[PDB]
Design a protein around this ligand. Structure first.
Ligand SMILES: C[C@@H](Nc1cncc(-c2cnc3ccccn23)c1)c1ccc(N2CCCC2)nc1
Length: 293
């Protein structure tokens, strides 16, 4: 991510310092080449001494100094952002006594992408459920933009679903295998989620709040498609780069309401400045949520 007008400039509040000995590691939730997320049990974290379930992000012994300092920066940013209902909230850290361990909220229903594909043909997902995730993810992204922060990888895979059908925006990062995930394309220097990126991001590497809105539009698409891959069954080749720059967008999903598709259209505008802000999107989804009463 970015902290636009530095992650190392951010300070570390030692109020998050939690001891390694009060964590009990369990089922590995996510795993990448240098890091992974583990579902651990933190004895005495919120209450005085009451056990709770957390997701501890950590690295494998194969991660070196840049990868380790990337994790300390991840931690500093989360500490800064603080709390929001619709983000995977930082619960504490272990920085002293060993390697970096970033202890965060655990979302029991895993990611939204796999949840949607499971729900695609334990409770049925209706239109009100999908509209809720639109509003919730929009609110969380509006809060990220509010704290002058930019995700750079907003997708249904990087959105988790917890109890009470609450979507929380997260980032696996080093904790996901970009090698085998075919949604990440090689670009001669690194692997990027091309299908979810804006033109300035693809052709200029300009990662601004505005580009995070095109990515949000791509999320709206897979959300309303109940899991479908953006530009499905399609290879991410040079032929792909032409029609996108031309102005070719995705067709409306079989379940997407009319107002929602208009939102994907303005998000998918060629001009990054003529795109809705995350705060304005909240008001539009609020409108459609009241219209349904
Ligand atoms: C530190 C990191 N922890 C994390 C990352 N990804 C997913 C989970 C996770 C929680 N529960 C489950 C269950 C199943 C699978 C995964 N998980 C936890 C993190 C990284 C960025 C982050 N944010 C918040 C502002 C934008 C990015 N929040 C948190």
């Amino acid at each position: 991510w970015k902290v636009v007008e530095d992650p190392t400039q951010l300070p570390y509040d030692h109020k998050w310092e939690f001891p390694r000995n009060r964590l009990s590691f369990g089922k590995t939730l996510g795993a990448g080449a240098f890091g992974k997320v583990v579902e651990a049990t933190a004895y005495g974290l919120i209450k005085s001494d009451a056990a709770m379930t957390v997701a501890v992000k950590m690295l494998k012994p194969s991660a070196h100094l840049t990868e380790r300092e990337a994790l300390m920066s991840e931690l500093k940013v989360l500490s800064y952002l603080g709390n929001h209902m619709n983000i995977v909230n930082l619960l504490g850290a272990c920085t002293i006594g060993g390697p970096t361990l970033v202890i965060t909220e655990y979302c029991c229903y895993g990611d939204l992408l796999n949840f949607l594909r499971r729900k695609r043909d334990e409770l049925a997902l209706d239109l009100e459920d999908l509209l809720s995730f639109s509003y919730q993810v929009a609110k969380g992204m509006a809060f990220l933009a509010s704290k002058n922060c930019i995700h750079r990888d907003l997708a249904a895979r990087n959105i988790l679903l917890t109890h009470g059908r609450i979507t929380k925006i997260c980032d696996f990062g080093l904790a996901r295998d970009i090698k085998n995930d075919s949604n990440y394309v090689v670009k001669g220097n690194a692997r990027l989620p091309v299908k979810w990126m804006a033109p300035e991001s693809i052709f200029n590497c300009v990662y601004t709040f505005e580009s995070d809105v095109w990515s949000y539009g791509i999320f709206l698409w897979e959300l309303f498609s109940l899991g479908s891959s953006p530009y499905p069954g399609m290879p991410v080749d040079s032929k792909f780069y032409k029609m996108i720059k031309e102005g070719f967008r995705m067709l409306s999903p079989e379940h997407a309401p009319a107002e929602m598709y208009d939102i994907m259209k303005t998000c998918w505008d060629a001009d990054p400045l003529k795109r809705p802000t995350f705060k304005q999107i909240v008001q539009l989804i609020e409108k459609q949520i009241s219209e349904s009463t």
